[PDB]
């Protein structure tokens, strides 16, 4: 079952169809090479234990529940809305009580009655698509797979493959 | 006052009324649709066509065209360097397809 | 052959419109969800090889 306490899987980035461009083992870290002493077995793999533990906690707090590593499209509720709020325009003119003045021979280039109009306005409809880059970090905390490739295929992460498509369940790269 | 005084004259005719699909009896509109492909009626009746009267009016009324000006530059042998700082006034929106 | 320029002058044409119609439009297109976007007809990286 358990084969080590393994290095996390770092997800890549992409210009977003809703994929995270697969993931791959972290190889910008030690903790699985050689040369030190045998008294560092609980001084260097206690480190690696600690890193993984911080990851499980970190992922659980900051990540929405999902049935898939890469959903390929987040719902409109779960993209995180950063769209603007309402605003007000003070309209500069009467055009229904300072136009009978120009018909009355007045040329123009606030002296008539104190009618001033305020107009409200809103902002866009919800969008569904790939996740933002600020919210990529919180949705893709590195994953620790603790029993690598154990059990039947069909519970293996195939979403760590940067060629896989989960809405056709095939890997096609045209190579 | 002015509006009921002059306007029933014009919608007696059909230069200010409603379109023919609305002033013809519904049986005649139904027949004209049914028979359209071999015995047109869509010619014997005028539709009014009335320009919007408000919220597009010039109002104060200011220029339709501008030209922007001569002063000095930094000299170059094979290129001609031109700068503008544009004119500004009040409440218009420029389209850059209409600049040359 | 030689070419001179005397007068390089800039022209602009404005659609006359109400200053309430105009000012409504400005507020609409000062939102970043109403950002204008444009793209080249031939959008290409152009590379010449001998």
């Amino acid at each position: 079952m358990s084969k080590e306490i393994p290095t996390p899987y770092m997800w890549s980035y992409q210009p977003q169809m809703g994929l995270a461009a697969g993931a791959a083992q972290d190889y910008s870290t030690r903790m699985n090479w050689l040369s030190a002493g045998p008294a560092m077995i609980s001084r260097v793999n206690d480190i690696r234990a600690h890193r993984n533990q911080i990851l499980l906690e970190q992922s659980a707090l900051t990540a929405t529940p999902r049935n898939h590593l890469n959903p390929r499209n987040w719902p409109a509720a779960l993209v995180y809305q950063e769209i603007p709020q309402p605003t007000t325009v003070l309209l500069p003119r009467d055009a229904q009580a300072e136009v009978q003045l120009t018909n009355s021979g007045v040329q123009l280039a606030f002296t008539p009655r104190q009618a001033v109009l305020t107009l409200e306005s809103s902002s866009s409809q919800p969008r569904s698509g790939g996740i933002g880059t600020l919210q990529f970090v919180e949705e893709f905390t590195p994953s620790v797979y603790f029993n690598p490739f154990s059990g039947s295929p069909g519970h293996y992460p195939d979403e760590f493959i940067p060629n896989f498509d989960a809405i056709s369940e095939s890997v096609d790269g045209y190579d | 006052m002015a509006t009921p005084s002059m306007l029933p004259q014009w919608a007696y005719m059909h230069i200010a009324g409603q379109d023919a699909s609305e002033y013809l009896s519904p049986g005649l509109v139904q027949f004209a649709r049914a028979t359209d492909t071999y015995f047109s009626l869509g010619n014997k009746f005028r539709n009014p066509t009335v320009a919007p009267t408000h919220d597009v009016t010039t109002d104060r009324s200011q220029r339709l065209t501008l030209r922007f000006v001569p002063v000095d530059r930094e000299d170059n042998t094979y290129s001609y360097k031109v700068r503008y700082t544009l004119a500004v006034g009040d409440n218009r929106v420029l389209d850059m397809a209409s600049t040359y | 052959a030689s070419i001179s320029f005397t007068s390089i002058n800039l022209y602009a044409t404005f659609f006359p419109m109400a200053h309430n119609t105009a000012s409504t439009l400005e507020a609409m297109l000062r939102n970043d969800t109403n950002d204008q976007s444009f793209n080249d007809y031939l959008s290409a990286a152009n590379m010449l090889y001998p």
């Binding site: 325009v89 003070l90 309209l91 009618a115 001033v116 109009l117 305020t118 107009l119 409200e120 | 066509t49 009335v50 320009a51 919007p52 009267t53 408000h54 919220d55 597009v56 | 419109m17 109400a18 119609t21 409504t24």
Partner: peptide, 21 residues
């Protein structure tokens, strides 16, 4: 198309209205 005559829209600019202040 075979048209030589514009439409009018038959409605002015902006449906949406603001309160007097």
């Amino acid at each position: 198309d075979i048209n030589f005559s514009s439409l009018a829209p038959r409605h002015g600019t902006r449906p949406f209205m603001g309160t007097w202040s």
